[PDB]
Design a binder for this molecule. Structure first.
Ligand SMILES: CCOC(=O)CN1CCS(=O)(=O)CC1
Length: 185
């Protein structure tokens, strides 16, 4: 792909994070803590899952960023509406305002309803995410496999400002402690 020139500098928004997440001082890395991280509750925080939003809001244009997922067993990545539900149980679907892919139990799937199987021959260590707001497109790229396409959501109905979306996943196994990292431009 030739989307690299739309690169944007994404930072994480502390105030949206699940209370067990640890966001680095530079706001470029997030990981699961082993306990509550001693922050107050607020209506922005994701309560049920280890999720956080980027600070940036997008309502036009073309945007591209990359995320490092090295040695993780589970994660979700993509974009979501600024107004997604924060509290309680919900599925990641375009109907609920999410355009995402994930890794879970050794398989990759796109967050459609119902979910779609992805065909990845080279497990990615870094994922590229491209958003074209006007075209209604969200695309995912395998940076480890020379930028190969993973998945395209098309005919997206964003219906609001978009935020970068992250889930570091649960660490019940002891094998998913590694962080998500925003990779340099
Ligand atoms: C994020 C919501 O908190 C929990 O469900 C509690 N806990 C699950 C197992 S874990 O992922 O090892 C650490 C967090």
């Amino acid at each position: 792909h030739h989307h690299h020139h739309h690169m944007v500098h994404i930072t994480l928004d502390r105030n949206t994070a699940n209370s067990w997440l640890i966001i680095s001082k530079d706001r470029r890395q997030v990981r699961m803590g082993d306990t509550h991280q001693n922050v107050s509750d607020n209506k922005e925080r994701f309560s049920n899952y280890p999720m956080v939003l980027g600070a940036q809001r997008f309502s036009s244009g073309k945007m591209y960023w990359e995320v490092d997922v090295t040695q993780k067993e589970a994660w979700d990545l993509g974009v979501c509406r600024d107004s997604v539900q924060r509290k309680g149980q919900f599925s990641l679907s375009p109907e609920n305002g999410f355009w995402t892919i994930w890794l879970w139990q050794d398989s990759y799937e796109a967050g459609t309803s119902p979910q779609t199987t992805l065909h990845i021959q080279v497990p990615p260590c870094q994922i590229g995410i491209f958003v074209d707001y006007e075209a209604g497109v969200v695309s995912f790229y395998n940076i480890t496999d020379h930028g190969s396409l993973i998945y395209t959501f098309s005919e997206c109905v964003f219906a609001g400002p978009l935020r970068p979306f992250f889930n570091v996943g649960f660490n019940y196994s002891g094998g998913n402690a590694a962080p998500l990292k925003l990779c340099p431009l």
